[model samples]
Target chain A: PRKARDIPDEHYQRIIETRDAIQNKYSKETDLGRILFRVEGNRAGKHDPRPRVFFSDYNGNVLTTDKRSNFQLRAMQNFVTSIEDYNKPKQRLYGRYMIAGPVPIVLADSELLMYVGFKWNEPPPLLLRLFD
Target chain B: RKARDIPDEHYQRIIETRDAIQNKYSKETDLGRILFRVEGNRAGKHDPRPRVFFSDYNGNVLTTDKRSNFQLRAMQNFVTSIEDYNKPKQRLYGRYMIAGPVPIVLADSELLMYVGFKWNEPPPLLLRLFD
Candidate 1:
């Protein structure tokens, strides 16, 4: 097995730390919701500086699955289907991420109460496994 | 202390919200590893936002133009979502939490991940002032 955190990329220490904090913060249920940003990647070095992340940290209303059919099944059913789709990573459309926070240091004081999301400038490593 | 410069309250906010989120979601599902289903234009580059979106409306931000906009808008949205916790269940902040090793690529790719945060609980008291 390739295994998680096999051979760490020490160059991108902050990035790795951020992901670790996200895991520590919200593991299981949200764990079931972790996005595997890369489709196929096995590199030892991270490309590009941390790019600017575009986000929509809004409140009250959810950015719904407007199509309505994405989550129409029973709660338990929805959970199972998500699991299936997760294991079999395939392309259906476009994908993106907001890898922010955990310790959002560069932000101004007011933005602290909120969290963030955005597209990674370059594809990041899959969570546990390092360049395998 | 190098970490001292990060400020005491800042650390407090992150842990507070984090702990709250864990407490909330842990009670909802039983799955140990939620998958993001790596999909989409895996080998592509994402174009900038379609049209400009300012969360503050007045366009106030710590920095201007380029990357700062993304930073400010994201944090603003996060704040708004949390503040609106009084709204109905249909309403709440949503976010995509990424798990697994962050795949490193040799070249730039345009693949994007759809995500958000849950704004269900009231804002933490330590976060109220931001120190």
Candidate 2:
């Protein structure tokens, strides 16, 4: 895996534009500057994994969240690059425990912008159980 | 609360059959047991009670010979008891909640999940029974 580079200015500007369009049309809160991206990685034989990105106004709320989000190409490209930095020798050890499904990334916030990795599914070895 | 109009014999039969089914299949790893327990009215409001139609793992019906004498007889009695219990409620409430043979389904699939009740109310039968 290679190291991540900063996203080009033009691409970042386009994401900001799209985010503004979405907020104006859907959300009333003018200061809703939090932007999160979720990537679904699909593995194909003998090829690099493909990533799909979705934009969200809030973090993934498992209990009460509705599935309403938009797809973004620039977010997907940035995530693909970030994974290179994520897979560096030191990070690789911790990354092994992360589940291989939808991974959420926090791309920007009002105070600061950064990439964060998190898992979506339960570990494979754990028995899937439902309770009353 | 008013006393239920069910016959003493029928009430006894339902209890016996319920116990037999639970005893035979209640182990943690049994899918049928897990399905039965999870989908019961015991879970309370906001949880959807989907109607289940059960079959063997390979989706075959357990014929009389395939089932144990106890299982076959208990199942038949259980079906009769459930129908009897459900009828008056259905007449008064205009719905059936959870009637059972406990072992019984389409399309070669072992499980059929269907929502038989509207979500606006917690199932009255389970609420009544527990109360």
Candidate 3:
């Protein structure tokens, strides 16, 4: 058996296909000051269903402050940089578990500025993030 | 409270961004509109029930098929978050609050590095950082 070439964005369709169970129930929230998302809706239990955005603060690591369920976090664009599916590969779903960012972020507090400058420890233009 | 008007420069950027975001997924968009379940009437004086949709960026605001599902969700997320980020009560009070130009996952394989803009009021403009 030979190895197949991996064109990164190639399998996005598959990933998108797996998101049906978590759409309206859980979406992304681009507010705050860092990278994060909301749980959305009410929850009877730790993982029943609640509406709250999640994010990785200083470490850029996004772990639930609650239960560990199926989740995914995309950063710097379309890559499912972070993911955790309770349904492992044994069931036929490709195992995807990743944590996005620590990837650079920009911070600002102005109201009329258009774009911003860029630096390493500093920041860049402020467009707003789901984690903003 | 009187609604703040969107300034000239800000307005310009908003248009640029909206177009940018739309262009990225225009092919997938069935109609040039996105449906939203607006509560509090979505910051307006008068409103309707489950009949609210923003028509600026012409992406697949509808169509939940597997093909465009991820992109649609991402757009939904983008619009929702951006809308919240620009709310009057607790909007991000930054003059140049465009943290984008930053890539938004139009899908797992694609990215819309849109720098969404927010004026004090109507005519939402999104910043298009890339093509």
Candidate 4:
């Protein structure tokens, strides 16, 4: 399928302003500034997916001491669990297992601020095989 | 406390009195004015002794059937909790501390016709006649 549909100038400008407003409100405490998901490549290290309200430290790191479970760790766990489940119950699992680990992640940074950005990554052939 | 078990004759008399009171007042009258009191003295072997109590004007009687457990608990819990709060030792003064706004009506005989959370010490049946 083709990507990048043309949007009206006014609508596009409004979207950028809304994105800036969100980034401005949450940027005070963190050293690294923030950007909307579309502007930069998505980073796995940043961004919280959980519901609980929290603030990140000045270094743009969500202040989590525990190595096992940190800010937005549930997302990672979910991703890994989904991948494993996708791989299971398939006969030709050998070729599929090789490209399974560390799916492509995007990282975006400005001079002082760093924000996580992401784009949809294609699922590995082996993982797609399990779906069949 | 001494072992003061009420005799079967006394039990029968209490039931008779309760039924008499219920029959006298049981009618479809003003929804707000309608009152009920469980005969604590004559509550049967299985039934817990319920202190005399009445429903408020705003209280929906249909709520009893809607959520039976909540309705049952509302009546019993409100009465028990309010009475505890109203004790002189507690000195609780409010429109409705443990229960909501509802006035208790009494019979001319000084037997409580209705039981409710009152704002002040209730006047006697004789006092009502004087006014």
Candidate 5:
């Protein structure tokens, strides 16, 4: 089975980049909150075709899905835009909106194993179960 | 004190929309519980916006502001779909669905508010924002 330590260097780098972009864009909105990256895999047997990545907000809002770094980044951007819109009206008759934290990043053993056994030529798995 | 100066037709539409939605999703089911909390804005402010909010049994709350009659009707439709869960025509997986058709307006300006499911999962009612 694969482990967190076995994640491909390129894929790991992409995740870091996505996180950085999100952080940079929303640095001013303290209430906009942080991102959590969860990795899911198979552990009971051989790895599946691919692992899944879930990017979520502090309030457990799933921002994006899939294993691709680009998709995750785009999802984060979309979420940030939504938050910006929510807070644009500072003169509103209510308090500013905020997301409560702490963000979670889960790496499932099944997903780790899938990454290890992933075949470069095969298609990724469809219908990934994002949440329990 | 501000009054809801909405047109009579709009007021009628709101009541009709609520009733039509209720027929499909009664107020007794788990999803119904959330829908029952929807209340008209009582802040008494001069803002002509149609505001709505509800707290679930778990004490989680969903709030929206500056809603047009159209968006409110859409929200009713969205919540009605939640009651369809487990039925053959169920299109959603959980107690909630994404609020959508963004840029809801009141006049010429684009309405400045957030509305949509920020996450992919079925977020707690508190996290969902229709404002």
Candidate 6:
């Protein structure tokens, strides 16, 4: 459950407003960008004052396995396996996008940094080419 | 169990990096004031067991259980293979997107994490010059 205090009602409203305004800025195939921000954390209590933002691009290639692999085969063979690893899983794990926008607020402690990886769509096979 | 050898130079380099950061920010900022004291050392753990544990020194630790063993091993292999690479130097004028593991301890008696840097336009400079 999300703690009600971590985000105020105004924050949610702002997020919705921002999404509505910028949702069409990028296409589904757009490249990913990363942003880092610093904010007052728990140790600072209420008035911690070190807020900053940094942005960059991800320069790594995404990877995916071949469909003929044993794992995929096993998933098709076993109904339960398919459900556990493939069928129900979210499909957006390929290209990257803006992790956080400009002026990201730090939510946690500085020393304890958080690293997250996100993909916007499914990746192509590791060693396959698409014919147009 | 027999012990494997890792050079003292590696730890020394880590210390040097920590000290440099500490000194650079000590004058104007409260950075690197806390010490990263490595309080515990243990042999490798058995496979298939839980790989994460929290210690006083390391906060919110994670590790390789049997399921994630491949992930942990791949990380270890990468770090060891790339041990010769130089530490990343942040540009004085760059905003620099930084990412890495939380530096927490893990199972397999090995820690796999990194301090990767990606450069960007510094906000202070951009705001003053571009705006």
Q: TM-score for all predictions? A: 0.15, 0.18, 0.18, 0.15, 0.17, 0.17
Candidate 5 lDDT over B5-87, as tens digits, reads 22223334434443443443443445434333433323333333333333232323345443334444444444443332221
Each prediction's whole-model lDDT (CA): 0.24, 0.29, 0.27, 0.28, 0.29, 0.24
lDDT by residue (A1-132, candidate 3, tens digit) is 211112123122222332222332222423332221233222344342222223232323443334334432222112222223212211111222222112122222211101011111211222321211
lDDT of 5 by residue, A47-80 (tens): 3223222344334244433333443344333333
Q: Write the per-residue lDDT of candidate 6 for residues A17-96, one digit (tens) a residue.
A: 43333333322323333111111111132121222112211221111222223332232222222122221211111122
| Candidate 2 chain A lowest-lDDT run of ten | A89-98
lDDT of 3 by residue, B1-131 (tens): 11132332444444454455445445553332221211122333221111112322333233323232333344355444443233211113332122222233232223323332332332122111110
State interface RMSD in Å for all models: 22.0, 23.9, 20.9, 38.5, 21.8, 21.7
Better of 3 and 6 by DockQ: 3
| lDDT (10s digit) by residue, model 1, range B64-126 | 234333433554443344323221111122322211111111112211111122223332211
Q: Estimate candidate 1's alpha-carbon lDDT, on a 0 to 1 scale.
A: 0.24
DockQ of candidate 6 against the true complex: 0.01
TM-score of chain A by itself in each prediction: 0.20, 0.28, 0.20, 0.25, 0.27, 0.21
**Reference contact recovery of candidate 2:** 0.03
Q: What is the DockQ of each candidate?
A: 0.01, 0.02, 0.01, 0.00, 0.01, 0.01
State the DockQ, from 0 to 1, for candidate 2: 0.02
- Of candidates 4 and 2, the better by TM-score: 2
Model 4 residue A100 CA deviation (Å) reads: 42
> B1-131 in candidate 6: lDDT tens per residue?
11112112333443344344334334432111222221111124332211222122223233324333443443343333332233321111122222222232222222323322223332221111000
Which sections of candidate 1 miss by over 4 Å? A1-50, A54-98, A102-108, A111-132, B1-131
Candidate 3 lDDT (Cα, 0 to 1): 0.27
